[PDB]
């Protein structure tokens, strides 16, 4: 269904896992939940929360929901250089234009999420729901173009077709 | 300038009053910047309900044009008139004081739905054989 | 209700299943309750509104066959 960036070989960064219930006679819930962010170890889009009858299916649901069945805004190369704010399904991440590479600091499990996402180069504060199941959206709302490549000639990139169109 | 297609009906015993009232309305219209487009008297007619008893009344369609000033003077007279049992008068927005698809239905009313009396000699004086007389 | 003219010289019926002028057709939708001035316009006047569902019913029969959900 939903198409994503390039990768070669994938890392199943499971950041969190949980269990749901509402057990009763006839129709019931008894499954497990799992949360994974999928990437290549530098920068890729993809985030999936899924659930199933047991722990093996729970994780396979989650890895499918990252890679398909999910709306994302795209990335190019494993680095950011279009730092801007945004909103996707209430979740707000703000990034002011500053240095690339160095300055990276974010608490709890989030510094590890940012390394597979490609936006550990430029980053600033989060607002809206502050839970690690929904704020991993960094490379989506915090990137409002479909490519943000590492050559600074990116701002001449669309220009070279526009003045040839003149 | 404004058009008021005024139609009214009058009680039988009172129908004598109408030939005079219309001729006082025509001289105030033609005397001050309006027109009588057609002035049709319809004769005596069968009601669909007896008003003030008796199941017949006598109908007149005046087909008036008059300015805002003039129509204001005819209408305060007509509204406090006593011979009229009831009236309905229409607006300048798509008014039809000239030619209608009630041409057949008027002839019918005089022809077939009338009652022949002394009040009804007066019905022919009401819009065709006009004499100045009453209010 | 029976309405003033509907059958050719009555028999043992009165044929009230058949004809009506306009005898309450905008003014009554709820019984055992007080009347209002502005409310009737959306509360009581649903005659057009109930025609949308009669149209849908002649529509949904064909579509159930094409889907073969019949």
């Amino acid at each position: 269904a939903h198409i994503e960036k390039q990768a070669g070989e994938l890392q199943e960064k499971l950041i969190a896992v949980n269990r749901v219930s509402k057990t009763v006679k006839g129709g019931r819930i008894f499954s497990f939940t799992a949360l994974t962010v999928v990437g290549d170890g530098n920068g890729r889009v993809g985030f999936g929360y899924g659930k199933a009858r047991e722990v093996p299916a729970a994780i396979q649901k989650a890895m499918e929901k990252a890679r398909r069945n999910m709306i994302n805004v795209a990335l190019n190369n494993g680095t950011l250089q279009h730092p801007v704010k945004g909103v996707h399904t209430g979740s707000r991440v703000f990034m002011q234009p500053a240095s690339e590479g160095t300055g990276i600091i974010a608490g709890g499990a989030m510094r590890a999420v940012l390394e597979v996402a490609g936006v550990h180069n430029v980053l600033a504060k989060a607002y809206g729901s502050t839970n690690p199941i929904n704020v991993v959206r960094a490379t989506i709302d915090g990137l409002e173009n479909m490519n943000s490549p590492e050559m600074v000639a990116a701002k001449r990139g669309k220009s070279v077709e526009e003045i040839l169109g003149k | 300038m404004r058009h008021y297609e005024i139609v009214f009906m009058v009680h039988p015993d009172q129908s004598e009053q109408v030939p005079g009232m219309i001729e006082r309305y025509t001289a105030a219209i033609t005397g001050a910047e309006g027109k009588i487009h057609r002035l049709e008297d319809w004769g005596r007619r069968q009601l669909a309900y007896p008003i003030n008893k008796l199941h017949k009344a006598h109908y007149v369609l005046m087909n008036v044009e008059a300015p805002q000033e003039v129509i204001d003077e005819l209408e305060t007279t007509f509204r406090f008139n006593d011979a009229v049992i009831r009236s309905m008068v229409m607006r300048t927005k798509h008014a039809v004081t000239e030619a209608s698809p009630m041409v057949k239905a008027k002839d019918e009313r005089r022809e077939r739905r009338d009652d022949f009396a002394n009040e009804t000699a007066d019905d022919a004086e009401a819009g065709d054989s006009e004499e100045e007389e009453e209010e | 209700p029976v309405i003033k003219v509907r059958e050719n010289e009555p028999f043992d019926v009165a044929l009230r299943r058949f004809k009506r002028s306009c005898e309450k057709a905008g003014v009554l939708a709820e019984v055992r309750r007080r009347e209002f001035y502005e409310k009737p316009t959306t509360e009581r006047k649903r005659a057009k509104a109930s025609a949308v569902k009669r149209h849908a019913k002649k529509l949904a029969r064909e579509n159930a066959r094409r889907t073969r959900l019949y």
């Binding site: - | - | 003033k4 059958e7 009165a14 044929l15 005898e23 309750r33």
Partner: protein
């Protein structure tokens, strides 16, 4: 089914003809047969026939009221009939069915329903 009434067979005003009136409500029907120039020749009701509740307005309760009056008015000796119906209350045909079993020819169902030109504001009673 019935309660006391006039006779089927004797003589009173000897009129030969009448008009009948059915006053139909949500709870009762009043059926009163009258003279054709305007004077009552007999009456019944569905409650005076031994019905109560919602059942007092059903078509079979409207029937037995109508067959009750229709018996009585033969002492005044009707032979032909015309009918008025006046209400939105149930079984406006079942009362006619009884008048024709009393031997009458039914001559128009002339609607003169008692509905006003809106009239008065109706009882608060219930909440919907």
């Amino acid at each position: 089914a019935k309660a006391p009434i006039r006779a089927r067979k004797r003589v009173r005003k000897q009129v030969s003809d009448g008009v009948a009136h059915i006053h139909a409500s949500f709870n009762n029907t009043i059926v009163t047969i009258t003279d054709r120039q305007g004077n009552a020749l007999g009456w019944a009701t569905a409650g005076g026939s031994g019905f109560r509740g919602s059942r007092k307005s059903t078509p079979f309760a409207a029937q037995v009221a109508a067959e009750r009056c229709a018996d009585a008015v033969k002492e005044y000796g009707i032979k032909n009939l015309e009918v008025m119906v006046k209400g939105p209350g149930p079984g406006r045909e079942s009362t006619i069915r009884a008048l024709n079993a009393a031997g009458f020819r039914i001559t128009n169902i002339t609607d003169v329903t008692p509905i006003p030109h809106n009239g008065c504001r109706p009882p608060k009673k219930r909440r919907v």
